[PDB]
């Protein structure tokens, strides 16, 4: 069918779980009321998402911008560090190009301590 | 996986008429005829193999696996295949236009003979944005009569005369009306050519002469292969080139018709199957065609093959047309006699009146109908028509039960297709073949009856049916009334209207048509209905009123002489209502 554009404003994964909780809330809302063919993506999303950060929040996300602003890492890395491999050494070395590079000794460790200030 | 699928409603805008050129028939080709004659019956169980009729073309019988597709008659429609014709056998219908395309062109160089501004002026003319079809035939005539007067070809070599098409289907162009007593450079060669003929054998040439020059269908086809691009527009042919320009007006290939065009006629008793005339045509063609195929190399001679190839243009012309069959030709066998009329197989069945366009196409047949005699009645109000229950049992009507009908329609199911208030059929939304309720069931079947189903109830009161008399004259012929259920057998209506149908009773006949969808049903009664049609379409005067006995009866009642009494007036008012 007709497409009006390639890609709109970039949407990472946070509010997915949040607004699929609305899709949840509407139809049967799963595990609670337990006591079509939308179940394919439904059970799939919430499972993969939530299981990661367990073994989320409301405000501190919007307040995580502070030092995430002053850092020049731009976009592709920005919404990526939200989930994968928080706060240890060579972890974040994989995602962002020129990770060590320019500023090294202290300033990047400031990333580690704050993303460890997540949980 | 499992990608999405979309669909859109589509109407029809225009058509495009043209001649498919040499690409399409071999592209649409499934099989090839080959073989020859001989329906190519396998000699065991007598099935057809390849040839004209064949397991994959179309199917004449109920089993007959098509092998292109499956499901036989109820699935397959038709498939196309081609035929190779030795030499470019000439056309039939385009023949009149073939003279014109052969007219404006000079034979020597095979190019247009017009000159500069002339062509430039006409090319500007037709490209005026609005044009009537009349302007086309006007200019395409003109441009063709402009090349008549010019005896001089422009940029190319020598020149020639006109083409008058003398004979049928024999094209001969007379070089004639040369400049009187003026020696031409070509004539000096011309007369010099014959001097070397009449020298050897003076007998034959002086005996018969002055037939000038003809054009063979092959060589005029090679004469059409020079002009391309340039202007075919003055010749009437526009090129967006799906088609290869008028090289296509001469037969080379051929679209052998499917079995859906003509079948193999069965039944009519007998222990056998029967071919149809059109099948005999093309199976004969493969013979007279391959006759040249085998020839032209090994055996025979020059002038024998000639009339046989001239016999080929006779067959194909007769095949798709009528009066081209007898251009100085008769079939011999034992001698005896000819004159079988029906043999024409194509342009006839397609011809007007009975065959296709008039009788069949716009003349179609109406299902769910009935017919019976007439008979009067005072008691039926106008717009009411009493239909006998006996023909009302076989007269159905579709009903989709929703939110309301659930109550009564399930009672109609258990009632049975014998007594009047019942249903002869049932259709579930799960799309079965169909459920006919006669043979059994009923009972429990009426317990479920889901909403999305469809059930056909017997015709009853409160319905809409349009009435008709066959010899139609004017707009007041077709009307629409309410129906009713009464005894015996007849079609009886109010005597208030004998006018629109012009009904003398006398035992005439009357047509009956019952609509289907709710749309068309509401359309008939709320528009075509009697109450709205009470006035004549032309004069604007009432066309329907009391007649005969009703008129003279009202007279005696309202007669100035007569008087009445309360008791007598009482029942009279009670007779009124």
């Amino acid at each position: 069918m007709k497409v009006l554009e390639e890609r709109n404003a970039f949407l990472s994964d946070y509010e997915v779980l949040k607004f699929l909780t609305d899709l949840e809330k509407k139809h049967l809302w799963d595990q609670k009321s337990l006591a079509p063919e939308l179940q394919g993506i439904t059970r799939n999303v919430v499972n993969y998402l939530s299981i990661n950060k367990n073994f989320m929040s409301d405000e501190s996300f919007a307040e995580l911008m502070t030092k995430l602003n002053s850092f020049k890492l731009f976009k592709a890395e920005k919404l990526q560090i939200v989930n994968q491999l928080p706060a240890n050494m060579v972890h974040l070395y994989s995602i962002v190009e020129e990770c060590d590079a320019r500023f090294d000794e202290k300033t990047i460790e400031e990333m580690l301590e704050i993303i460890s200030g997540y949980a | 996986k499992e990608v999405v699928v979309s669909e859109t409603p589509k109407r029809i805008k225009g058509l495009e008429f043209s001649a498919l050129s040499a690409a399409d028939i071999v592209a649409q080709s499934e099989v090839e005829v080959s073989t020859r004659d001989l329906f190519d019956l396998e000699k065991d169980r007598a099935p057809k193999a390849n040839g004209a009729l064949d397991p994959k073309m179309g199917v004449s019988s109920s089993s007959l696996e098509c092998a292109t597709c499956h499901g036989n008659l109820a699935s397959c429609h038709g498939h196309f295949g081609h035929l190779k014709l030795a030499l470019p056998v000439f056309h039939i219908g385009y023949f009149k236009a073939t003279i014109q395309i052969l007219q404006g062109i000079c034979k020597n160089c095979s190019a247009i003979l017009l000159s500069e501004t002339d062509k430039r002026q006409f090319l500007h003319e037709l490209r005026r944005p609005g044009v009537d079809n009349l302007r086309r035939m006007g200019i395409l005539k003109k441009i063709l009569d402009q090349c008549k007067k010019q005896r001089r070809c422009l940029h190319c070599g020598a020149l020639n005369g006109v083409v008058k098409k003398a004979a049928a289907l024999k094209i001969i162009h007379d070089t004639f009306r040369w400049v009187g007593k003026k020696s031409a450079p070509e004539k000096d060669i011309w007369v010099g050519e014959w001097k070397e003929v009449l020298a050897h054998n003076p007998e034959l040439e002086r005996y018969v002469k002055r037939c000038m020059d003809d054009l063979n269908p092959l060589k005029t086809l090679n004469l059409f292969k020079q002009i391309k691009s340039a202007d075919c527009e003055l010749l009437g042919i526009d090129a967006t080139v799906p088609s290869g320009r008028p090289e296509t007006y001469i037969w080379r290939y051929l679209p052998a018709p499917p079995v859906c065009i003509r079948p193999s006629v069965m039944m009519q008793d007998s222990p056998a199957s029967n071919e149809d005339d059109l099948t005999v045509k093309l199976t004969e063609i493969v013979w007279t065609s391959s006759l040249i195929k085998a020839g032209l190399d090994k055996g025979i001679s020059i002038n024998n093959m000639m009339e046989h190839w001239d016999y080929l243009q006779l067959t194909v012309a007769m095949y798709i047309n009528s009066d081209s069959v007898n251009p100085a030709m008769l079939p011999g066998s034992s001698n005896g006699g000819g004159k079988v009329k029906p043999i024409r197989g194509f342009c006839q069945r397609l011809k007007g009146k009975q065959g296709r366009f008039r009788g069949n196409l716009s003349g179609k047949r109406v299902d769910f109908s009935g017919r019976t005699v007439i008979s009067p009645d005072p008691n039926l109000s106008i717009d009411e028509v009493a239909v006998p229950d006996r023909v009302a049992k076989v007269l159905t009507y579709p009903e989709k039960v929703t939110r309301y009908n659930r109550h009564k329609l399930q009672e109609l199911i258990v009632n049975g297709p014998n007594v009047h208030p019942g249903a002869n059929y049932l259709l579930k939304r799960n799309e079965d073949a169909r459920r006919n309720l006669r043979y059994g069931d009923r009972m429990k079947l009426a317990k479920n009856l889901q909403i999305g189903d469809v059930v056909e109830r017997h015709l009853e009161d409160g319905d809409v049916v349009l009435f008709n008399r066959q010899p139609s004259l004017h707009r007041l012929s077709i009307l629409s009334h309410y129906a009713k259920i009464r005894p015996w057998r007849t079609f009886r209506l109010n005597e208030c209207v004998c006018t629109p149908y012009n009904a003398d009773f006398d035992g005439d006949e009357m047509n009956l048509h019952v609509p289907q969808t709710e749309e068309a049903r509401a359309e008939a009664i709320n528009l075509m209905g009697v109450k709205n049609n009470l006035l004549t379409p032309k004069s604007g005067e009432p066309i329907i009123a009391a007649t005969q006995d009703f008129i003279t009866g009202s007279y005696l009642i309202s007669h100035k002489d007569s008087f009445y009494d309360r008791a007598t007036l009482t029942q009279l008012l009670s007779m009124m209502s």
Partner: protein, 97 residues
Amino acid sequence: YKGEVLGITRFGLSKMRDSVLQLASFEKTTDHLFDAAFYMKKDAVEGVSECIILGQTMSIGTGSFKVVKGTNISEKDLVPKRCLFESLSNEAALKAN
């Protein structure tokens, strides 16, 4: 109206109408079909007797207008809501560089 008196007869019935099927309907068979193919005519499916062939609707009478129903939907609530995505992303790259 065309500026010349003619009509109602097969020779005079071809004046205005460019539709080949309805003209081959009333009176003609072979000529009109081959003639329209020769000149490579196009025209259109427009008229009444033309439409009853292809089996579609009519441009006159009941079919002169298109029926439409209102959606009744409000013009307000349609507006989307975006949160937390358009804050951190763009404002980070737009400060000082």
